[PDB]
Homo-oligomer: 343 residues x 3
């Protein structure tokens, strides 16, 4: 909620409490999943053209006991925006791949999981320098593009080290570049995004699958957002980029997400979806294996802009086999029941 | 403080800094105890009858160095409330036992410690689904009741596991049900609350005292709140529910708290109290032993709605013996000196 | 930003996102250094004379992955202030030494590092009871003084223990007293501050350098703040107080900081600085060694009260030798590039 607006600066303090509960035969995905998010979006007017901004967003689990409570920063960046020239921001933010893949990431709780956080330039991560452009310098109504750089986030100790080092190799990344082009026009949307990033020595020399000099992704996306209907689909091909449970990464992966939603006037919003992640030439005798594969069904009911409830049902199509057990990937169904307050 | 109220939704952002210091011969209870709380209470009007809400509250210790700072979510829930039918909320909240036992939990710093947090349904804990009713469907002015369910919060690894697992057995709980009835009338208050919950395999199979299939509690409470006077008392009998230091739980426990307070017009509010927790048939050669026993004396001075100071003096009546030393229970006195700002 | 002000109480909710990046040949000081601060300053009017207040400030790193995010309380105190008599506050706060040494701590990112946090009474730390006086009881315009007490912050286990114990000996302290006198007059500033504090048994009996019964400091400071110019300098002599990397403390240390800044009307603010910390009679064959020594150059550009960017360049004059390598002190240069949003 916009709690402050005076003399050029305005601040939006926003958050939600998500009363959430998972039902699953997988005990590790069964139980209380309640959490809270808090954040601010700031905006200051510098000149006629220039404006400065800063966003921060934070998650604090609400399903843990008081002796040990986990929380983390989702985004934290600051930037400048100049009318018809572009914007620049730096900090923890979403990678440019997400500019397109986010069109399918629209379900209440599940979905958007053919990629993780801190997964190179595919979603949220540290050290993003991002240039964005709206309506191609104000000339083409609806044509947006972005060029982004991510600086190396290395290990905590030894060489290949950075000030913000991290022992988990799945959260590390070398220097990377990516970009995206988006075009919307009266309901329709065509999108593309490419990214390439050096992989660190640690994530290429600890006996994991899917090693190589670079982690790369290629994304294309379609959508339709009008007349109470939402349809979307994204296709992304990755190399040494998609995480394969605990085993490592997939040398090659073909990701597909599709979503269909409808919005009734009285507040109900059913949805149907299908996600899939096919790994190819994984090595170590695995060959071609589904990393992710599930239908997702359910509905959200909006009481209000501030209150909603939902049922989100993940029908897991993965088979329980030696590959999935070695990686520790969930093959069981999950039902998420939500009750959410926002402001 | 209510920092936002517009078009049906209103938000109260509240908090306090409690400048606090303990004086004690027990070194582990002697020193700086300064802390901070922050929270929001949200309320959105859906219809004439229906309203949606969400509360979050957080504690962050202010007595630690910057290298290592502990903090935790006290509550985090979201709910709906329908006039003259009831309310429903889910998330981290207070158990229904507290509906009555909270009448004695009214001292500045000590008190309210014949039970812990994450102690089955006795106080704050994860995964509470709570139904509450005000004035018995609007028919009986002052008759409130509540029915509550808590879902299993298991271990972090192995079986008996949940998505929000926790290695500390004292914070675990199986599926539980409880309830409470409250009646207030022109200053007086009669209350009752029962709760029963399955205990987990981990908390019944790690060689601790007070094991059994179920942890159970039975509570009755009296009070008087008028003419600048506050009196209250609660009696709760527990089985396999009251924690006994580190040794385990008490197979049977009889808890009693009594409080007397008076409020002077100029801001001073003296108080006298007595808490006691008698364990019975504890096993392992212990027999009947006081788990908790102390008089509590002192006073708060209110400068304002936003500023207060207090002296809270815990006279520990427990004897230092092999039982208390084995459990690690404090037998020494503590004096808490407070200086508090609120908003 | 002042987000609340009603019926005597007013609350300022303030924060910043600092998009920050270090460039260094030292890998441990090279990379993303992005962070966020959040805080509130509260003020309640009790009477004509008396006012109650409370400040809290918090840092949350923005350069870490979601699996592991570090954050900490910088300050957390509550106090009363009586017109022309003085103020009193308790909690986590700045020590009185900082009343003078803070005049040089005015650079964007570096500087203010001839002392650490939780470093006895030299900067921020737990358990400060501080009395302050403005304009010497309202008699002398510009003469301020302060008397401060810090209570022992001991170890986590054993004896020499406190309720807020801490295993890191560099964060521990015994009972201490200090004070400061400040005089400002039409742009000029003369300041002095002394502090003495018992050192704990743990920090005198773990085989570190710079042991002794007491950690002591003696500070003098000059400054000039007017006509778009800022000049400042502080000299502090310490005994058993200045931390020497990992090796321990310096038995004797002579600290000097000097700063020169200029503020252009169009927003640019160049600065030049020099910090130095000379250790004397360090023991263990080290003799006299520079603990800290660097020139600091750069500039901040203010777009606005809410938005700024800066280059902060630390020219490290320390030589790489066996002393600095044993202590783990950085001898390499660092360049910090900042983009900041505030509110
Ligand atoms: C507002 C500040 C903008 C800073 C943009 C970041 C510039 C990228 O800086 C990069 O950081 C990497 C470590 O993360 C180093 O390995 C690279 O050498 C360096 O070029
Ligand atoms: C808004 C969402 C409401 C969800 C109410 C919680 C329903 C209780 O769900 C319970 O959770 C337990 C694990 O915690 C499981 O062991 C039980 O089988 C399950 O019934
Ligand atoms: C608002 C509350 C004000 C309390 C002021 C703190 C009083 C100092 O209390 C000191 O604490 C030390 C441990 O930290 C003990 O070792 C000392 O014996 C004790 O005097």
């Amino acid at each position: 909620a916009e709690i402050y607006n005076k003399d050029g600066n305005k601040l939006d303090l926003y958050g939600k409490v998500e009363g959430l509960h998972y039902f699953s035969d997988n005990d590790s995905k069964d139980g209380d999943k309640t959490y809270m998010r808090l954040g601010f979006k700031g905006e200051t007017q510098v000149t006629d053209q220039l404006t400065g901004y800063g966003q921060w967003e934070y998650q604090i689990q609400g399903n843990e006991p008081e002796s040990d409570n986990s929380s983390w920063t989702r985004v934290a960046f600051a930037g400048l925006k100049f009318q018809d020239v572009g914007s620049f921001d730096y900090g923890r933010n979403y990678g440019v791949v997400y500019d397109v893949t986010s069109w399918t990431d629209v379900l209440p709780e599940f979905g958007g999981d053919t990629y993780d956080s801190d997964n190179f330039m595919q979603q949220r991560g540290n050290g993003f320098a991002t240039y964005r452009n709206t309506d191609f310098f104000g000339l083409v109504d609806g044509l947006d593009f972005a060029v982004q750089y991510q600086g190396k986030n290395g290990s905590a100790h030894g060489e290949g080290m950075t000030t913000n080092g991290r022992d988990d190799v799945f959260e590390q990344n070398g220097d990377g570049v990516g970009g995206s082009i988006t075009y919307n026009y009266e309901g329709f949307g065509i999108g593309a995004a490419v990214s390439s990033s050096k992989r660190t020595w640690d994530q290429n020399n600890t006996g994991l699958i899917g090693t190589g000099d670079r982690a790369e992704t290629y994304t294309g996306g379609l959508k339709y957002d009008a007349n109470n209907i939402y349809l979307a689909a994204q296709y992304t091909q990755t190399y040494n980029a998609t995480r394969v449970g605990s085993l490592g990464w997939a040398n090659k992966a073909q990701n597909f997400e599709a979503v269909a939603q409808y919005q009734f006037d009285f507040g109900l919003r059913p949805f149907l979806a299908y996600l899939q992640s096919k790994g190819k030439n994984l090595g170590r005798g695995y060959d071609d294996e589904d990393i992710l594969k599930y239908v997702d069904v359910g509905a959200t009911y909006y009481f209000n802009k501030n209150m909603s409830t939902y049922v989100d049902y993940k029908i897991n199509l993965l088979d329980d086999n030696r590959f999935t057990r070695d990686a520790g990937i969930n093959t069981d169904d999950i039902v998420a029941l939500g009750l959410v307050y926002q402001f």
